[PDB]
Amino acid sequence: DVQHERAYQKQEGASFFNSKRYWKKVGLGFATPKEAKEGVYVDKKCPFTGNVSIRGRILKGMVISNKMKRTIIIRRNYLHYVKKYNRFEKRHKNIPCHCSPCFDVKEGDIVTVGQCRPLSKTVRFNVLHVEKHQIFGSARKQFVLF
Amino acid sequence: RDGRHKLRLTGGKKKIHKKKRKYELGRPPSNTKLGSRQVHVVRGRGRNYKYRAIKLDSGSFSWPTFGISKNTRIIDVVYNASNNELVRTKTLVKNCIVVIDSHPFTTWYENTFGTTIGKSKNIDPLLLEQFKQGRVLACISSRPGQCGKADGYIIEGDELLFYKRKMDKRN
Amino acid sequence: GKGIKKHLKRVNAPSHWMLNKMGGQYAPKTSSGPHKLLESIPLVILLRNRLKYALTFDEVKMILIQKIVKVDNKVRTDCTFPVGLMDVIHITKSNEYFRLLYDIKGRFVPHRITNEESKYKLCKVKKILLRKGRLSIAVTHDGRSIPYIHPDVKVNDTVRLDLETGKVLEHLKFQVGSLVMVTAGHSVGRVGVISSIDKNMGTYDIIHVKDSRNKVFATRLSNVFVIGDNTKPYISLPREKGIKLDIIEERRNRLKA
RNA sequence: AACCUGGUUGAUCUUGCCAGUAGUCAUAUGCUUGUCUCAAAGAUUAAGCCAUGCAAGUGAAAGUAUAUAUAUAUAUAUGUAGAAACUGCGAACGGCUCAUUAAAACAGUUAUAGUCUACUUGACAUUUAUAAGGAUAACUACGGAAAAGCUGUAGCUAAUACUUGCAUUAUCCUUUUGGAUAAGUAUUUGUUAGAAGGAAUUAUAACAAAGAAGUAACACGUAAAGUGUGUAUCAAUCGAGUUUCUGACCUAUCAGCUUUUGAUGUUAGGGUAUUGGCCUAACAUGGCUAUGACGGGUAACGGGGAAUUAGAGUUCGAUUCCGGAGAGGGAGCCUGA
RNA sequence: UUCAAAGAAUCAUUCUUUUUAAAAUCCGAUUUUGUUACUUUGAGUAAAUUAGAGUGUUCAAAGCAAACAGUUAAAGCAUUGUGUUUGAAUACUAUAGCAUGGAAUAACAAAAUUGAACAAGCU
RNA sequence: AAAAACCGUAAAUCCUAUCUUUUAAAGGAAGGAGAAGUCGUAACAAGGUUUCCGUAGGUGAACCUGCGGAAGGAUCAU
RNA sequence: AAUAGAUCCGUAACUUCGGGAAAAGGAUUGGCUCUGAGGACAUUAAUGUUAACUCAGAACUGAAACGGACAAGGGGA
């Protein structure tokens, strides 16, 4: 259940013998999710359960892809100003983020993520909060000012 | 030996300048065998010494349900979650599963509790069966190629049941 | 190799050092020590460019060889020694006492002070940390470590250290009535009563300061040095008294003579 | 200074370019040249090749002197110095160049709660002693080689070179005072309690195991006790490595790239100073792209900046400063912070 | 999808102040009420260069200096001598990032084949 | 201490392949420039068959012919 | 005479787009000891009984040899 393949993080600080489930607060205005607080999953890279600390900067984005295990692709859309023509142009760049199983995401959901230490070759952000959002058409084709 | 020469995030090849720096370094692995204690000294950055253990046979091992540690000797290597070649060649790594002599622990139990702080944890049958066998299962918890010593803890409960099932619906 | 750089080009030197472009290629790289190179001056320019006692680096060395100058009443013989944001200099042969302060244009000036005045040092604590045995040490802007500080002392407080013994005498807090001196900003050198402390979670906390003439200026909390309580500053201030005047009407006082 | 003029016709009005015009911290060159100040200068092509000589050395109290020389009251004591050499530190800075390099480097903006950090500064330490051991340079004698910043053998000798190694404190209580109790700095593992930060598996504390390295067998002398050198840890400082967000020229007669050969991610480990496919094993099929991926070109190091600017712009930036990279081309490695 | 009226002040107008729905704080009166773009102020911005303040390098390019009485001393201040008065400012440092006032203009969110809030009882 | 082996870091040389840049070439076939070549007369006038377009065939050359268009036509019109 | 099986890789001009093609051209192959993957059958999410040779990977080993004999394209313009 909690672990199926040959994979279990110790969940350091869980304590199993004497003590008096482990979770942190993350802070920064975010609320540790109830599913994280009372769940059974074990994630080494979860902001609320593992060793990772959220520090750096906070960003928002559309979930573009959730096809890999516990990580997602977040596309951030923004307007780049071209001085010569005195107008803007739509520009984008997608960033990969880790997504703990406490969060339930789909393509098109709007997530706010916080920077953490480099967890893989390309991921440096952990999703801190998810809001459901219905998308019509391709998620890449969507454009949101965040 | 770190950082560059990989493909970009997109899959594009990156033109390389900036020939290899020393601080990337990348020393060869320590394949810590099981045998007579020999370690070597590695001078890392800042003249900080790292103890690369070529072979160990004993180690500090902890009974965690009682929160004690006693110095025992490693008998055999029986599992590791990574490549099976490591157990087959009997190499000690940070999460290896080893067979540990139980006698120091059983003697300590006799001396402190009597009969075979916050005491009286009631024990379990699945571990004292191994104790009667004389040899017990333990998981390494240190990094022998980094600290120069193999230390670990007895596995009990669900994790022990898991590892026993993995070692032995099964053959 | 790429070890630490040991030279400082003149045009790369800090601006408040006031090193003329044409007077050489290099600047005296301050040795590592109590204060950052950016927010300190070396003794070479303290005794060569400000007091004009020396006409050259060799003359500065000649001064330092005789154990005459002291920084925080102990002998210093390093030419590139950081003096610091505020601290006492004693020239024994000429009997005189200085404190390094900022004028309202953010430049380090030696303020003449009295012998009795030259025993008090205002140190801005920067870190409070407990080591083995639950002993609390305060790391100050000067870079000293003061153990067994009073528990009431907080991170941004200031302490009045006795120079000869290195003991705290009294501490000052950071209320909205506490007067402060600004350290590195556009408003470096001003002295004001703290309008308020706008604290924002995760970024620089800003604090607003009222001058004597009710002019408000905001600054990063790291650029603030509590100098007194609401009664009076605990140090004599340079002749400007930490009041920055508008450029338009400083010209009026320049013209009237 | 927000400017135009000659040229298509037999003549006209247009479009439209050619030519004229001025500047260039923009180079070359022709002619000419009396003063003074001021000052760029082998970048362009050949990051082509180099004779010669110099460019990083260092001892004024403070490691080691019977090479040796000298001086004061009487073979003595103080000395003054000191060739050489050992030891220490520096030579990783500086100076030069711009070949490489196109989200790379660089710039602004973050993080390091993912790390290392010599000199310097502040704190400050723990499991034969009227002072311990061998062995070496310099030096002496005998040599080898055409030659080299080559060195063999034998004999001596020191050092802050190399290596051994000599108390004490804290806590409980009748309660100034008496007895009782206890003794590892970093670092690693297991079980726990928990001033600050935005958030801690933080500081710290307790229990159980290991355990580095050290806490001076060292040198010179200031008030009518000092300094030097060396040392464990913490902090500061001088820095570095990684790192977040955003920003680049031309080209689609480059449209699909990446993925066995790590590509994207999970898990475990190895490695590192630390995080990380950085590497390995298993597993899943991911990742980027017409908002231009992947390619190609650049007679492309990036920026601060330069020229020309009414305003917009266009063009340049090898070159004072900063960052990067390199030492004929590659690769590897020792010492060392 | 929240619009005006009343007063003090230049010359004949302009210019400044207050309220007038509703829900949670204060016993007739005390006070918060989407997100962003955008815009305003800040913060933090190396110098050199640039703009620019001051300064007769004999002028100027410059530089960051300098100026003041003294055919031979008064003054200031020191309780007998100690020179004194100064400057080396400000601005700029993207478009991105941090903080911040915001009424307009733009988006997005929430909004019914239905969704709320209040009172009482029950858990 | 020589020396050896094995993983690794990996210069360098060779073979093969691909690409980029430059370049030789019998012959072929364009374009441009020549002060004054030969042949015709295609276009500009209804240019002596109105011109022109697309397309197809043919001819020494300009060009000619068929089909369908245009007026930029020689018709703004019983 | 030259290889010639099989596995993995790589494969041009040209083209009637089907081919060319086994193009060209590289690498590997034994033995041994192991590791992994691929099914069927019964009990009150859970534990036993049992079968094919087929693939993939790793250590070791040898006079560097392994389609060991047999069998078995020379390619290209």
Side-chain angles (χ1 to χ4, degrees):
Chain A
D1 191 53
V2 11
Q3 46 87 17
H4 314 146
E5 50 113 346
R6 167 71 284 293
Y8 158 78
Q9 332 304 288
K10 194 257 169 198
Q11 216 196 78
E12 301 56 3
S15 288
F16 295 82
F17 310 108
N18 326 126
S19 183
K20 81 303 180 193
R21 188 74 196 188
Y22 169 85
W23 43 275
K24 319 142 101 160
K25 242 184 281 214
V26 164
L28 223 34
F30 294 90
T32 154
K34 155 246 181 63
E35 326 77 348
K37 197 135 35 75
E38 307 140 5
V40 64
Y41 79 90
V42 47
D43 190 334
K44 171 186 63 186
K45 292 154 174 167
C46 168
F48 319 96
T49 287
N51 297 264
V52 298
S53 55
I54 290 317
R55 80 288 183 275
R57 53 175 83 239
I58 318 296
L59 321 171
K60 277 258 213 72
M62 194 153 304
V63 174
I64 282 317
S65 146
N66 65 333
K67 327 211 62 84
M68 62 201 132
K69 155 85 84 172
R70 295 197 171 172
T71 128
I72 47 141
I73 296 301
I74 283 314
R75 146 187 274 237
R76 305 216 313 133
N77 301 296
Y78 57 98
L79 289 177
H80 172 247
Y81 178 70
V82 186
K83 211 237 280 194
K84 156 168 210 202
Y85 302 97
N86 194 45
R87 324 161 145 80
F88 303 85
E89 88 200 327
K90 276 186 185 167
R91 213 177 266 202
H92 95 282
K93 46 188 46 52
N94 34 38
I95 89 166
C97 328
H98 185 262
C99 191
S100 100
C102 73
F103 293 119
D104 175 25
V105 310
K106 302 206 316 163
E107 298 62 345
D109 280 2
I110 305 308
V111 306
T112 146
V113 310
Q115 169 171 8
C116 59
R117 75 168 130 88
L119 322 166
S120 98
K121 198 191 170 230
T122 65
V123 301
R124 288 100 169 81
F125 285 83
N126 261 87
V127 50
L128 299 190
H129 173 284
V130 186
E131 57 161 299
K132 323 262 100 183
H133 191 262
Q134 168 140 21
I135 267 46
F136 316 97
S138 188
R140 340 193 101 81
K141 298 303 222 248
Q142 252 69 36
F143 179 87
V144 177
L145 198 46
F146 276 138
Chain B
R1 271 172 187 71
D2 293 324
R4 222 147 43 242
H5 89 299
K6 299 220 57 160
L7 290 188
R8 298 177 187 283
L9 179 148
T10 81
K13 195 160 20 172
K14 29 221 279 192
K15 300 306 234 320
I16 215 164
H17 40 115
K18 191 210 220 292
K19 87 155 46 58
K20 313 217 236 180
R21 292 335 198 216
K22 192 259 166 176
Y23 50 72
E24 290 131 351
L25 203 283
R27 255 166 237 120
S30 165
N31 321 273
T32 293
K33 275 310 226 73
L34 163 82
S36 312
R37 190 236 177 236
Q38 48 156 351
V39 313
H40 294 168
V41 154
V42 165
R43 176 235 199 259
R45 205 179 169 73
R47 193 177 208 51
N48 318 144
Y49 288 118
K50 189 165 306 183
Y51 299 103
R52 196 150 310 288
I54 319 292
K55 270 155 19 154
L56 305 319
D57 52 345
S58 47
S60 195
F61 276 86
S62 147
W63 204 346
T65 203
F66 292 99
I68 59 92
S69 208
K70 193 59 66 60
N71 205 287
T72 184
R73 83 146 184 285
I74 293 115
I75 289 158
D76 196 19
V77 161
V78 286
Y79 186 80
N80 96 152
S82 321
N83 181 2
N84 260 342
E85 280 301 338
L86 295 151
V87 26
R88 170 209 267 185
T89 55
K90 312 199 172 317
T91 73
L92 310 166
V93 278
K94 189 212 154 313
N95 212 46
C96 209
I97 308 288
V98 305
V99 171
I100 272 311
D101 183 21
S102 313
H103 289 95
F105 295 101
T106 59
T107 58
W108 168 93
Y109 198 92
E110 302 325 274
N111 266 67
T112 73
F113 273 78
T115 325
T116 184
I117 45 191
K119 325 312 289 153
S120 149
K121 245 79 56 189
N122 198 16
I123 217 175
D124 91 7
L126 203 34
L127 188 63
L128 45 78
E129 168 297 328
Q130 274 147 58
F131 284 146
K132 159 208 50 52
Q133 254 284 36
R135 298 113 207 167
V136 87
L137 289 163
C139 171
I140 309 270
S141 54
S142 71
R143 307 190 69 200
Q146 303 286 301
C147 57
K149 65 178 142 273
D151 303 330
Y153 60 92
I154 294 175
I155 54 176
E156 67 267 43
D158 273 28
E159 226 50 31
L160 179 270
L161 204 186
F162 165 87
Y163 280 126
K164 148 144 44 63
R165 195 140 211 222
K166 285 243 158 233
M167 287 159 74
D168 227 308
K169 266 198 186 178
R170 250 291 312 159
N171 216 254
Chain C
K2 284 298 307 307
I4 295 99
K5 264 172 176 209
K6 288 178 162 53
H7 293 55
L8 194 38
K9 299 294 185 69
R10 263 197 117 80
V11 304
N12 197 15
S15 43
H16 56 76
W17 285 11
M18 301 170 176
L19 285 212
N20 72 318
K21 306 185 298 159
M22 313 313 323
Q25 197 92 346
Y26 302 97
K29 182 154 207 209
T30 80
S31 286
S32 60
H35 297 79
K36 290 182 181 297
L37 171 137
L38 283 200
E39 30 190 302
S40 69
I41 59 164
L43 268 291
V44 202
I45 76 174
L46 179 52
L47 306 125
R48 181 178 69 166
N49 307 44
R50 307 284 172 271
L51 308 184
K52 331 297 301 202
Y53 277 140
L55 329 178
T56 191
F57 199 102
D58 279 351
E59 283 188 348
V60 152
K61 170 61 103 160
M62 281 162 190
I63 301 298
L64 296 184
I65 276 303
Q66 35 202 18
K67 276 76 103 193
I68 305 309
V69 304
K70 293 153 66 69
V71 184
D72 305 315
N73 69 17
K74 90 164 56 184
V75 151
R76 290 297 171 198
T77 175
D78 193 3
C79 322
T80 64
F81 193 77
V83 190
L85 306 173
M86 97 192 328
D87 67 326
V88 303
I89 304 128
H90 179 29
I91 306 171
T92 64
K93 278 267 283 198
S94 83
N95 172 190
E96 37 167 332
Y97 290 92
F98 294 116
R99 205 192 278 287
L100 222 59
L101 263 280
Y102 285 130
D103 46 14
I104 39 60
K105 278 137 177 199
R107 321 162 293 211
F108 268 128
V109 283
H111 185 12
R112 319 294 277 225
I113 55 171
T114 70
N115 185 99
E116 265 71 86
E117 208 258 9
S118 86
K119 270 140 200 52
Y120 324 149
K121 161 163 213 341
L122 275 197
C123 267
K124 164 206 186 67
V125 48
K126 275 161 125 212
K127 286 209 304 190
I128 175 176
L129 82 177
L130 65 136
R131 284 297 101 111
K132 199 100 103 171
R134 236 203 198 185
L135 102 121
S136 281
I137 309 128
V139 180
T140 75
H141 85 98
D142 175 349
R144 340 259 291 293
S145 304
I146 291 92
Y148 329 100
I149 34 86
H150 193 287
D152 278 37
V153 178
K154 273 321 121 181
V155 154
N156 292 332
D157 287 29
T158 165
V159 290
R160 173 146 85 73
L161 224 46
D162 214 87
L163 271 317
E164 62 60 20
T165 196
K167 263 71 142 196
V168 350
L169 306 188
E170 87 265 61
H171 74 62
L172 307 89
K173 323 279 271 143
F174 28 65
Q175 319 321 63
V176 296
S178 55
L179 71 97
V180 311
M181 164 139 173
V182 186
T183 316
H186 292 184
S187 44
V188 49
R190 337 254 307 265
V191 179
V193 200
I194 287 189
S195 311
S196 98
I197 306 177
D198 311 81
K199 155 161 308 282
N200 15 30
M201 191 210 324
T203 323
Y204 314 110
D205 300 302
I206 305 307
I207 75 143
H208 302 185
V209 198
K210 301 258 306 303
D211 227 352
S212 294
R213 293 107 43 70
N214 325 127
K215 320 185 153 273
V216 190
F217 51 99
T219 188
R220 235 173 244 192
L221 168 137
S222 156
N223 295 301
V224 161
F225 203 124
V226 182
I227 294 316
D229 43 65
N230 4 20
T231 82
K232 50 101 170 151
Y234 280 19
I235 314 168
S236 74
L237 294 183
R239 37 155 137 185
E240 307 337 295
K241 227 65 54 187
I243 295 301
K244 227 199 170 150
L245 279 193
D246 215 3
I247 46 148
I248 71 104
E249 55 56 36
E250 297 200 353
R251 267 329 282 180
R252 320 187 43 70
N253 331 97
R254 282 293 301 283
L255 278 206
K256 67 174 64 23

